[PDB]
Backbone as a chain_set.jsonl record, in Angstrom:
{"seq": "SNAILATMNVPAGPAGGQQVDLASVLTPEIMAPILANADVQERLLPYLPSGESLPQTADEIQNTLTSPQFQQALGMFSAALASGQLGPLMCQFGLPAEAVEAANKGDVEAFAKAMQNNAKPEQKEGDTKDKKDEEEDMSLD", "coords": {"N": [[16.063, -4.738, -29.081], [17.054, -1.622, -28.505], [18.036, 1.892, -27.993], [19.712, 3.898, -29.578], [21.944, 6.155, -30.635], [21.16, 8.22, -32.947], [22.97, 9.712, -35.212], [22.158, 11.685, -37.388], [22.002, 14.49, -37.731], [21.571, 16.593, -39.641], [19.894, 19.092, -40.107], [18.669, 21.766, -37.707], [16.139, 22.61, -35.291], [13.965, 23.517, -32.962], [10.82, 23.362, -31.836], [8.709, 25.365, -30.61], [5.924, 26.887, -28.172], [3.414, 28.972, -29.263], [1.335, 30.242, -28.073], [0.662, 29.053, -25.882], [3.318, 29.44, -23.525], [5.489, 27.38, -23.394], [8.219, 27.573, -21.421], [7.196, 28.891, -19.483], [5.006, 27.531, -18.558], [5.812, 24.775, -18.185], [8.196, 23.874, -15.849], [11.796, 23.685, -15.047], [12.455, 21.488, -12.791], [10.207, 19.611, -13.532], [10.578, 18.916, -15.961], [13.535, 17.783, -15.774], [13.377, 14.883, -14.709], [12.307, 13.613, -16.681], [14.036, 14.461, -19.287], [16.472, 13.375, -18.334], [16.286, 10.864, -18.746], [17.502, 8.721, -20.916], [16.369, 7.779, -22.94], [14.491, 9.301, -24.049], [16.149, 11.257, -24.428], [17.248, 10.24, -26.683], [14.932, 10.585, -28.691], [14.819, 13.184, -28.861], [17.221, 13.731, -29.948], [17.161, 14.329, -32.963], [16.176, 17.005, -32.98], [17.66, 18.449, -31.739], [19.315, 21.333, -30.937], [21.81, 23.031, -32.263], [24.736, 23.407, -30.629], [23.668, 23.123, -28.389], [23.729, 20.538, -25.689], [23.103, 17.362, -24.342], [21.979, 17.002, -20.924], [22.627, 14.226, -18.192], [22.001, 13.875, -15.721], [19.42, 14.762, -13.245], [19.894, 16.988, -11.53], [22.058, 18.489, -13.093], [20.841, 19.207, -15.314], [18.907, 20.831, -14.229], [21.082, 22.93, -13.693], [22.473, 23.663, -16.245], [20.183, 24.194, -18.3], [18.691, 26.47, -17.116], [17.229, 29.008, -17.92], [17.699, 30.327, -20.824], [18.866, 28.096, -22.48], [17.131, 26.46, -21.492], [14.677, 26.861, -22.632], [15.422, 26.236, -25.39], [15.999, 23.615, -25.299], [13.825, 22.579, -24.211], [12.46, 23.233, -26.302], [13.143, 21.635, -28.105], [12.067, 19.1, -27.257], [9.323, 19.785, -27.035], [9.163, 19.432, -29.818], [9.916, 16.689, -30.54], [7.722, 15.868, -29.028], [5.592, 16.9, -30.609], [5.789, 15.51, -32.979], [5.042, 13.023, -32.321], [6.665, 10.943, -31.35], [7.843, 11.163, -28.794], [5.801, 10.139, -27.398], [4.558, 7.651, -26.013], [6.239, 7.479, -24.079], [5.753, 9.348, -21.779], [4.007, 8.065, -20.24], [5.309, 6.311, -18.949], [6.633, 7.751, -16.828], [4.805, 8.253, -15.083], [2.905, 10.065, -15.827], [0.023, 12.09, -16.207], [-2.89, 10.641, -17.963], [-4.099, 12.411, -20.063], [-2.149, 13.81, -20.477], [-0.008, 12.134, -21.739], [-1.863, 11.012, -23.922], [-1.798, 13.609, -25.392], [0.824, 13.911, -25.813], [1.276, 11.895, -27.789], [-0.71, 12.581, -29.524], [0.475, 14.72, -30.505], [0.101, 17.285, -29.544], [1.164, 20.151, -28.556], [0.199, 22.224, -26.521], [-1.855, 20.909, -25.286], [-0.596, 18.842, -23.743], [0.994, 20.541, -22.04], [-1.118, 21.802, -20.777], [-2.729, 19.599, -19.708], [-0.656, 18.558, -18.356], [-0.147, 20.669, -15.848], [-2.873, 20.841, -14.849], [-3.463, 18.086, -14.23], [-1.129, 17.146, -12.738], [-1.251, 18.729, -11.022], [0.313, 20.089, -8.497], [-1.098, 20.242, -5.376], [-1.409, 18.757, -3.513], [-3.551, 16.526, -3.999], [-4.88, 14.111, -2.698], [-6.587, 11.407, -1.865], [-9.509, 11.248, -2.084], [-12.152, 10.205, -0.597], [-15.181, 9.213, 0.663], [-15.331, 8.421, 3.563], [-15.18, 9.914, 5.692], [-16.097, 13.391, 6.83], [-19.22, 14.718, 7.326], [-21.161, 15.321, 5.279], [-23.975, 15.36, 5.266], [-25.824, 16.514, 7.364], [-27.444, 16.159, 10.408], [-29.989, 18.13, 12.004], [-31.134, 18.367, 14.405], [-30.157, 19.839, 17.522], [-27.259, 19.009, 17.096]], "CA": [[16.924, -3.833, -28.68], [17.03, 0.073, -28.838], [19.119, 2.757, -27.577], [20.462, 4.522, -30.752], [22.259, 7.698, -30.832], [20.905, 8.852, -34.12], [23.44, 10.837, -35.627], [21.576, 12.165, -38.397], [21.966, 15.809, -37.444], [21.993, 17.92, -40.421], [19.605, 20.417, -39.793], [18.343, 21.613, -36.052], [14.814, 23.334, -35.182], [13.296, 23.239, -31.864], [9.463, 23.768, -32.28], [7.921, 25.611, -29.292], [4.734, 27.194, -28.38], [3.383, 30.596, -29.261], [0.157, 30.708, -27.338], [1.046, 28.46, -24.567], [4.597, 29.564, -23.33], [6.193, 26.196, -22.695], [9.087, 27.813, -20.526], [6.308, 29.582, -18.205], [4.137, 26.266, -17.926], [6.697, 23.647, -17.704], [9.298, 24.23, -15.266], [12.953, 22.442, -15.192], [11.785, 20.46, -11.971], [9.187, 18.911, -14.167], [11.454, 18.32, -17.153], [14.402, 17.003, -15.317], [13.363, 13.429, -14.433], [12.036, 13.086, -17.949], [15.136, 14.422, -19.878], [17.482, 12.56, -17.451], [15.961, 9.558, -19.284], [18.229, 8.53, -22.13], [15.405, 7.089, -23.974], [13.55, 10.571, -24.421], [16.882, 11.861, -25.371], [17.236, 9.394, -28.239], [13.845, 11.089, -29.722], [15.05, 14.687, -28.806], [18.372, 14.133, -30.798], [17.004, 14.834, -34.2], [15.694, 18.07, -32.864], [18.673, 18.776, -30.568], [19.619, 22.54, -31.606], [23.272, 23.292, -32.363], [25.443, 23.786, -29.35], [22.996, 22.129, -26.998], [23.832, 19.284, -25.243], [21.973, 16.67, -23.453], [22.622, 16.589, -19.361], [22.448, 13.129, -18.04], [21.457, 13.711, -14.474], [18.547, 15.632, -12.966], [20.847, 18.051, -10.963], [23.019, 19.261, -13.844], [19.889, 19.615, -16.301], [18.644, 22.276, -13.628], [22.068, 23.805, -13.623], [22.137, 23.809, -17.559], [18.578, 24.368, -18.33], [18.218, 27.387, -16.175], [16.003, 29.592, -18.792], [17.778, 30.302, -22.315], [19.186, 26.961, -22.893], [16.041, 25.654, -21.056], [13.621, 27.237, -23.708], [15.578, 25.741, -26.635], [15.914, 22.312, -25.004], [12.232, 22.271, -24.103], [11.708, 23.514, -27.491], [13.267, 20.231, -28.835], [11.311, 18.395, -26.329], [7.912, 19.859, -27.815], [9.371, 19.101, -31.334], [9.635, 15.401, -30.64], [6.336, 15.422, -28.804], [4.744, 17.002, -32.051], [5.759, 14.297, -33.977], [4.415, 11.859, -31.453], [7.989, 9.973, -31.092], [7.838, 11.198, -27.632], [4.436, 10.0, -26.82], [4.579, 6.311, -25.265], [7.426, 7.928, -23.126], [4.968, 10.005, -20.935], [3.184, 6.994, -19.47], [6.43, 5.804, -18.258], [7.055, 8.765, -16.064], [3.444, 8.51, -14.05], [2.319, 11.193, -16.354], [-1.492, 12.185, -16.542], [-3.444, 10.277, -19.178], [-4.196, 13.451, -20.861], [-0.503, 14.329, -21.225], [0.421, 10.939, -22.606], [-2.622, 11.178, -24.963], [-1.406, 14.731, -26.207], [2.268, 13.784, -26.409], [0.866, 10.882, -29.015], [-1.187, 13.144, -30.758], [1.595, 15.85, -30.977], [-0.385, 18.629, -29.273], [2.058, 20.567, -27.416], [-0.507, 22.792, -25.567], [-2.503, 20.07, -24.511], [0.291, 18.288, -22.894], [1.492, 21.609, -21.251], [-2.544, 21.879, -20.07], [-3.158, 18.555, -18.854], [0.139, 18.362, -17.189], [-0.618, 21.351, -14.684], [-4.069, 20.334, -14.194], [-3.523, 16.91, -13.351], [0.025, 16.944, -11.938], [-1.277, 19.946, -9.996], [0.807, 20.031, -7.067], [-2.037, 20.676, -4.458], [-1.608, 17.088, -2.914], [-5.046, 16.055, -3.645], [-4.698, 12.561, -2.398], [-7.382, 10.538, -0.746], [-10.671, 11.719, -1.996], [-13.14, 9.0, -0.196], [-16.464, 9.597, 1.498], [-15.274, 7.666, 4.86], [-14.984, 10.971, 6.724], [-16.715, 14.354, 6.52], [-20.385, 14.588, 7.247], [-21.812, 16.286, 4.291], [-25.362, 15.508, 5.15], [-25.79, 16.241, 8.988], [-28.706, 16.814, 11.342], [-30.629, 19.396, 12.232], [-31.605, 18.573, 15.63], [-29.036, 19.756, 18.682], [-25.954, 18.759, 16.521]], "C": [[16.849, -2.588, -29.443], [18.09, 0.622, -28.461], [20.101, 2.843, -28.949], [20.488, 5.899, -31.108], [22.272, 7.918, -32.009], [21.851, 9.955, -34.266], [23.086, 11.221, -36.984], [21.176, 13.757, -38.258], [22.237, 16.635, -38.677], [21.297, 19.047, -40.436], [19.434, 20.568, -38.098], [16.952, 22.629, -36.175], [13.964, 22.933, -34.361], [11.771, 24.071, -32.188], [8.566, 24.184, -31.155], [6.409, 25.982, -29.39], [4.503, 28.676, -28.422], [2.34, 31.134, -28.446], [0.781, 30.167, -26.025], [2.489, 28.29, -24.578], [5.251, 28.114, -22.818], [7.19, 26.482, -21.534], [8.165, 28.125, -19.321], [5.456, 28.401, -17.93], [4.825, 25.14, -17.655], [7.978, 24.258, -17.071], [10.474, 23.167, -15.043], [12.953, 21.369, -14.346], [10.859, 19.04, -12.56], [10.035, 18.299, -15.571], [12.465, 17.576, -16.766], [14.517, 15.779, -15.319], [13.065, 13.001, -15.995], [13.49, 13.375, -18.993], [16.401, 13.735, -19.315], [17.318, 11.211, -18.032], [16.746, 9.408, -20.832], [17.774, 8.231, -23.367], [14.838, 8.131, -24.584], [14.854, 11.352, -25.051], [17.23, 11.494, -26.462], [16.2, 10.212, -29.021], [13.956, 12.626, -29.624], [16.511, 14.995, -29.571], [18.24, 14.85, -32.246], [16.653, 16.635, -34.344], [16.649, 18.849, -31.971], [19.531, 20.137, -31.662], [21.155, 22.451, -31.568], [23.951, 23.914, -31.165], [24.899, 23.328, -28.218], [23.449, 20.933, -26.974], [22.849, 18.481, -24.163], [22.615, 16.313, -21.852], [21.983, 15.314, -19.089], [21.593, 12.978, -16.69], [20.564, 15.211, -14.138], [19.019, 17.195, -12.805], [21.347, 19.034, -12.222], [22.063, 20.004, -15.024], [19.567, 20.809, -15.628], [19.831, 23.387, -13.66], [22.503, 24.232, -15.145], [21.308, 24.71, -18.188], [18.298, 25.232, -17.379], [16.818, 28.119, -16.928], [16.566, 29.752, -20.278], [17.926, 28.919, -22.736], [17.849, 25.835, -22.749], [14.924, 25.777, -22.452], [14.005, 26.585, -25.115], [15.484, 24.333, -26.341], [14.305, 21.495, -24.794], [11.795, 22.443, -25.586], [11.717, 22.401, -28.28], [12.534, 19.056, -28.394], [9.755, 18.687, -26.745], [7.91, 19.31, -29.171], [9.067, 17.541, -31.454], [8.36, 15.14, -29.934], [5.28, 15.75, -29.887], [4.846, 16.069, -32.881], [5.051, 13.141, -33.357], [5.304, 10.811, -31.027], [7.839, 9.964, -29.727], [6.701, 10.877, -26.876], [4.28, 9.105, -26.034], [5.497, 6.679, -23.945], [6.878, 8.592, -21.896], [4.426, 9.099, -19.993], [4.04, 6.645, -18.374], [6.753, 6.361, -16.865], [5.657, 8.761, -14.911], [2.809, 9.428, -14.644], [0.691, 11.1, -16.415], [-1.589, 11.612, -18.024], [-3.795, 11.111, -20.237], [-3.411, 13.887, -21.516], [-0.054, 13.481, -22.106], [-0.338, 11.075, -23.766], [-1.923, 12.282, -26.083], [-0.029, 14.613, -26.662], [2.103, 12.698, -27.611], [0.146, 11.386, -30.152], [-0.339, 14.213, -31.182], [0.981, 17.234, -30.84], [0.381, 19.173, -28.107], [1.138, 21.525, -26.094], [-1.227, 21.86, -24.864], [-1.772, 19.247, -23.422], [0.341, 19.427, -21.778], [-0.041, 21.76, -20.36], [-2.753, 20.981, -19.02], [-1.98, 18.239, -17.681], [-0.177, 19.335, -15.6], [-1.806, 21.356, -14.113], [-4.184, 19.069, -13.7], [-2.559, 16.531, -12.623], [0.074, 17.796, -11.02], [-1.036, 19.795, -8.646], [-0.181, 20.838, -5.983], [-2.012, 19.668, -3.594], [-2.995, 16.673, -2.76], [-4.817, 14.634, -3.817], [-5.606, 11.987, -1.547], [-8.596, 11.057, -1.013], [-11.794, 10.424, -1.766], [-13.621, 9.405, 0.643], [-16.341, 8.324, 2.564], [-15.455, 8.566, 5.837], [-15.865, 12.075, 5.902], [-18.455, 14.081, 6.399], [-21.26, 15.634, 6.45], [-23.356, 16.389, 4.116], [-25.413, 15.347, 6.867], [-27.363, 16.218, 9.439], [-29.043, 17.758, 11.536], [-30.825, 19.786, 13.912], [-30.28, 18.524, 16.746], [-27.67, 19.954, 17.903], [-25.704, 19.863, 15.529]], "O": [[16.647, -2.467, -30.652], [19.149, -0.002, -28.525], [20.992, 2.053, -29.261], [19.632, 6.623, -31.617], [23.402, 7.883, -32.496], [21.709, 11.004, -33.638], [23.976, 10.983, -37.801], [20.091, 14.166, -38.673], [23.214, 17.383, -38.645], [21.893, 20.079, -40.747], [19.909, 19.751, -37.309], [16.819, 23.351, -37.162], [13.149, 22.076, -34.705], [11.692, 25.192, -32.69], [7.704, 23.398, -30.762], [5.69, 25.605, -30.315], [5.181, 29.494, -27.801], [2.35, 32.317, -28.107], [1.351, 30.907, -25.224], [3.05, 27.43, -25.257], [5.433, 28.001, -21.606], [7.104, 25.694, -20.592], [8.408, 27.61, -18.23], [5.166, 28.353, -16.735], [4.352, 24.44, -16.76], [8.704, 25.033, -17.692], [10.22, 21.974, -14.878], [13.345, 20.29, -14.791], [10.857, 17.879, -12.152], [9.893, 17.144, -15.972], [12.503, 16.501, -17.364], [15.532, 15.28, -15.804], [13.655, 12.018, -16.443], [13.985, 12.35, -19.462], [17.359, 13.619, -20.078], [18.213, 10.395, -17.815], [16.386, 10.111, -21.776], [18.324, 8.305, -24.466], [14.619, 7.966, -25.784], [14.693, 12.023, -26.07], [17.551, 12.32, -27.317], [16.606, 10.579, -30.124], [13.186, 13.306, -30.303], [16.928, 16.133, -29.786], [19.001, 15.734, -32.639], [16.788, 17.344, -35.341], [16.275, 19.929, -31.515], [20.119, 19.973, -32.731], [21.657, 21.704, -30.728], [23.578, 25.033, -30.812], [25.529, 23.142, -27.176], [23.606, 20.246, -27.983], [22.049, 18.978, -23.37], [23.535, 15.521, -21.652], [20.883, 15.114, -19.605], [20.687, 12.155, -16.558], [20.831, 16.342, -14.546], [18.756, 18.19, -13.48], [21.02, 20.22, -12.264], [22.362, 21.071, -15.56], [19.833, 21.867, -16.198], [19.561, 24.588, -13.654], [22.957, 25.376, -15.172], [21.647, 25.832, -18.567], [17.496, 24.764, -16.571], [15.654, 27.869, -16.612], [15.804, 29.242, -21.099], [17.001, 28.509, -23.437], [17.572, 24.853, -23.438], [14.507, 24.815, -23.096], [13.119, 26.384, -25.945], [14.834, 23.703, -27.174], [13.863, 20.383, -25.084], [10.829, 21.816, -26.019], [10.782, 22.051, -29.0], [12.401, 18.083, -29.137], [8.997, 17.718, -26.758], [6.91, 18.799, -29.676], [8.217, 17.096, -32.226], [7.832, 14.076, -30.256], [4.28, 15.056, -30.07], [3.871, 15.796, -33.581], [4.482, 12.335, -34.093], [4.864, 9.845, -30.404], [7.686, 8.849, -29.23], [6.597, 11.312, -25.729], [3.76, 9.528, -25.002], [5.34, 6.078, -22.882], [7.549, 8.414, -20.879], [4.415, 9.479, -18.822], [3.725, 6.64, -17.184], [7.076, 5.65, -15.914], [5.781, 9.417, -13.876], [1.874, 9.818, -13.945], [0.166, 10.016, -16.672], [-0.844, 11.86, -18.973], [-3.821, 10.617, -21.364], [-3.489, 14.297, -22.674], [0.31, 13.876, -23.214], [0.326, 11.271, -24.784], [-1.593, 12.01, -27.237], [0.334, 15.109, -27.729], [3.004, 12.755, -28.448], [0.193, 10.981, -31.313], [-0.492, 14.61, -32.338], [1.162, 18.156, -31.636], [0.287, 18.771, -26.948], [1.454, 21.452, -24.906], [-1.221, 22.032, -23.645], [-2.301, 19.011, -22.336], [-0.228, 19.245, -20.701], [0.091, 21.826, -19.138], [-2.915, 21.252, -17.83], [-2.177, 17.838, -16.534], [-0.379, 18.81, -14.505], [-1.943, 21.803, -12.974], [-4.961, 18.863, -12.768], [-2.783, 15.641, -11.802], [1.015, 17.891, -10.233], [-1.852, 19.471, -7.783], [0.019, 22.039, -5.798], [-2.853, 19.813, -2.707], [-3.553, 16.49, -1.678], [-4.601, 14.073, -4.892], [-5.353, 12.098, -0.347], [-9.038, 11.512, 0.042], [-12.201, 9.769, -2.726], [-12.991, 9.981, 1.53], [-17.097, 7.357, 2.471], [-15.89, 8.145, 6.909], [-16.279, 11.912, 4.754], [-18.922, 13.355, 5.521], [-21.901, 16.566, 6.936], [-23.961, 17.084, 3.301], [-25.12, 14.33, 7.496], [-28.3, 16.27, 8.643], [-28.245, 18.626, 11.18], [-30.739, 20.865, 14.499], [-29.545, 17.546, 16.88], [-27.025, 20.989, 18.07], [-24.653, 19.892, 14.89]]}, "num_chains": 1, "name": "protein.A"}
């Protein structure tokens, strides 16, 4: 059994990225399905800044974490990520192997990098050579 709302919040302190800006690489729509998971919320609790709250549904996450609050909430995200506490979670969302590895290693830039490199929405689905004449004939055709 797990599901522990650990109320041990004595300090506060999100840990964002200085080189790779998390808010410009990760958008609310990507974070929403993740943060809507109460399990990740558990891991974000120790890093939850003062005044911030954890939205339950993706829609309200978008409403609350528009930009200022988003950078703060994403900062606690990367904070739990840096600790590796948020690592195993990434695989359960169907996230890139490189991203889940990064989340376990606690590398926030690698996560952000691998996210938009692998979850890159260009709909590349179906790489198979059962079509395309990449080797053609020369005579008449």
